[PDB]
Amino acid sequence: ETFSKIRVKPEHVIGVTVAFVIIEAILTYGRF
């Protein structure tokens, strides 16, 4: 298995990704 002392539930990575999208999706576009 994995020696990853930390456990991360997928629901997070998904939501964290919805994060990158929103941030840059607006950080870039929607100028001004």
Binding site: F3, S4, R7, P10, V13, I14, V16, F20, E24
Partner: protein, 432 residues
């Protein structure tokens, strides 16, 4: 002792021993798929709306898309895996995985490196002049996003890998190529139209429909090849008489392998241009974007639209160059993971199904396998690699080679969907 400290700091994915319904593995996969396509729609935050064309060579095997939140794509992950197979392959760092140690060592380790290669590539990309404006400030910002997007994939892969079907990478690649096709042929600036319109305009352009043909031809070819199998008659499970007839995917054996060969070249054309407009011409003299001389030149796949005859020698070398590179990672796929006889042992032994030939024992079959493998392994790749390459001379939409992997990945993905549609009945035979 090992890099266990930071290694234990690198997050992972919570694998539930609960009920993960087919319907859920499916629905999961799909969510990953979309966040992907989506990320491929979003440009990277960068004022310099002006970018120097594109690298028509890295995108395909990388499943990336330069200029987007995934401009680096699977590229790192592949790079990483490439090194591992290189080290743990040429014995340089001999390891007998068997024990959950070496196994989880080889892995965990590689994973890390993937994040290392995640940033490296990022920097290397911008440093290769993938965007044009090297505003130390803006440059930094970009790299951030870039490698971080690739990170998301590394974790999205993990998700699919433990919450859905097939594989992230495998998926991802097929995801890209498929799209690259449906869009290139039918999308906005779609080719089918540019051709169709060219017919209406009254000036029939054979160059607009061409690439579309290239893809059919490849697909048709690549599939044929993907059908060939090496049938291994099996010995009656205690019964008597002719029985089994086990086939082996003679092509899909060297899958991950060729993915690495092509990916190697990917990191050369990148690493050469990079270490070109940022140093000395170690690898080759690019100019014009790609390379027009040097190791780089001799190792640049010819595809795109139409096959290039105007350089025979160039062809020859590449082909042979690829071929051998394939043999390599294939062999390095032997020393490591790959089909390991130790296991396949009792697996055929529990059922008491030795080969058709003879020898119904453990050490017996075990042997007959360890032996037959390598030639299989090498033949396969050598071939594939050839096919893949020639698949590029012909040249096609999405990527001759890309189409290949895809077609395979897609079928190995169909199988996955079946082994599942069934395992969704008898809650036990999760190993037959």
């Amino acid at each position: 002792k090992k890099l266990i400290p930071i290694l234990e700091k690198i997050p992972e994915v919570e694998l539930p021993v609960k009920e993960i319904t087919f319907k859920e593995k499916l629905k999961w996969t799909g969510i990953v798929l979309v966040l992907y396509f989506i990320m491929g729609c979003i440009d990277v935050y960068t004022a310099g709306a002006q970018i120097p064309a594109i690298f028509e060579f890295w995108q395909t095997i990388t499943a990336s898309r330069i200029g987007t939140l995934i401009t680096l794509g699977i590229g790192p992950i592949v790079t990483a895996g490439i090194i591992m197979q290189l080290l743990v392959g040429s014995g340089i760092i001999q390891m007998d995985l068997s024990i959950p140690e070496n196994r989880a060592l080889f892995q965990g380790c590689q994973k890390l490196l993937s994040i290392i290669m995640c940033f490296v590539e990022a920097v290397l990309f911008v440093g290769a002049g993938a965007f044009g404006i090297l505003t130390p400030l803006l440059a930094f910002l970009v790299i951030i996003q870039i490698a971080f997007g690739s990170i998301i994939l590394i974790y999205l892969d993990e998700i699919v890998s433990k919450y859905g079907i097939g594989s992230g990478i495998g998926l991802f690649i097929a995801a890209g190529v498929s799209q690259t096709i449906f869009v290139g042929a039918l999308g906005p600036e779609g080719y089918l139209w540019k051709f169709l319109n060219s017919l209406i305009q009254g000036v029939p352009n054979i160059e607009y429909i061409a690439p579309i043909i290239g893809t059919i031809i490849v697909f048709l070819m690549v599939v044929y090849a993907e059908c060939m199998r090496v049938e291994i008659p099996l010995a009656h499970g205690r019964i008597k008489g002719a029985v089994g007839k086990y086939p082996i995917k003679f092509v899909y054996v060297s899958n991950i392998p060729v993915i690495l060969a092509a990916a190697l070249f990917a990191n050369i054309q990148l690493w050469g241009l990079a270490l070109y407009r940022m140093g000395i011409p170690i690898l080759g003299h690019y100019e014009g974007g790609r390379a027009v001389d040097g190791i780089a030149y001799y190792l640049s796949t010819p595809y795109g639209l139409s096959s290039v005859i105007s350089d025979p020698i160039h062809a020859i070398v590449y082909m042979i160059a690829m071929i051998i590179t394939c043999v390599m990672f294939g062999i390095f796929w032997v020393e490591t993971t790959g089909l390991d006889p130790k296991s396949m042992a009792k697996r055929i032994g529990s059922l008491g199904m030795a080969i058709k030939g003879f020898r119904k024992s453990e050490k017996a079959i075990e042997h007959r396998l360890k032996r037959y493998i390598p030639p299989l392994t090498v033949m396969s790749s050598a071939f594939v690699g050839f096919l893949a390459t020639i698949a590029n001379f012909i040249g096609a939409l999405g990527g001759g080679t890309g189409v290949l992997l895809t077609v395979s990945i897609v079928y190995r993905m169909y199988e996955q969907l079946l082994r599942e549609k069934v395992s969704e009945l008898h809650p036990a035979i999760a190993k037959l």
